[PDB]
Amino acid sequence: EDKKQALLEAATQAIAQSGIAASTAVIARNAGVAEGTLFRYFATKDELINTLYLHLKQDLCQSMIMELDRSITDAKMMTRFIWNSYISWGLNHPARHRAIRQLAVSEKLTKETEQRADDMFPELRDLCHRSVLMVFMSDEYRAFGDGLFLALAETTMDFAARDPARAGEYIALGFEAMWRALTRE
Amino acid sequence: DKKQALLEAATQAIAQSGIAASTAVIARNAGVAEGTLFRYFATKDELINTLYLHLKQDLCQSMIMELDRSITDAKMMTRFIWNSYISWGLNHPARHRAIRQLAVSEKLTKETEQRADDMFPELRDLCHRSVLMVFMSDEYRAFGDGLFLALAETTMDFAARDPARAGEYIALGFEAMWRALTRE
């Protein structure tokens, strides 16, 4: 539904600007529909959080797969592509990125929502289990591992954005920082 | 009670919504009026520099306060310090979110940065020794600080919402930080 879609887009800008606490009424006005129209698509605010996130994460992963040169047979060079695509996505889509960050840090994501976010780039689990330190694949510390990678990717992005001039150098500098910190001997 | 009033409001405000936090909102959250804030700080960029120096001074005092010299080995040294950083952040999440924002606005002046590094003279010297040259440079020093803050801030979040394993996160966090910006 272009109407569903409109709602997802309005939800993106509203959440980007105000957080998950963004009024379900304000979302509806910006989408041109009535608060009830929305309730028929997203039963609860939590189910919205979860559907947005999947839709944003989908988008994020389409960019990555598309930019991924499947002829790259080197793990580090492969990780470079993911790192590069992840950063470009955020730079070219500030709202989608702000929004997806809130959702992911909202504490309202179902485990169901998690497993659906993986099936969108399964061969990507393949990279980690090759390069990443055993402890960061650990059931106890993988969340932590991904976190470090993410905070590292976010700062690189802040810099690249605030100082366009040098982005390429930040992006490179940030990758090597993350490789030495997260990756195997 | 003067400028001290504003610095706290500025802290929370900048911690809540970033460096974009208005001088209006800061005064309200302070009690005084937007005009009052500008009494104590000529400009906003002057508030940024002063707030940074105020929080930094508070962090260093505490790191210095918690450093035992008996610990000679440089490795174990930095680990004891990193520990002191994590605790402070975990004790004052707002102060730490404000410091991090301020850490790389672009508005910190040079005398600000210099006066910043002369507050804990020996840590400075520690850094300058073991830390990738590019992260000491003028054009990437701030980025090196950003990366360091991101890693610490991530440790503080995990340690905080999963206390059961705070000692492990703090440890994995240290190592990751170590390999990331350190040396052999």
Ligand SMILES: Cc1cc(N)c2ccccc2[n+]1CCCCCCCCCC[n+]1c(C)cc(N)c2ccccc21
């Ligand atoms: C903004 C934002 C901010 C957050 N704190 C956050 C936290 C949790 C989840 C999403 C988050 N988001 C949004 C996150 C959306 C998912 C982002 C995943 C992009 C790709 C995953 C990267 N992947 C990871 C993780 C770790 C690796 N070692 C690795 C190595 C090689 C290749 C890929 C690799």
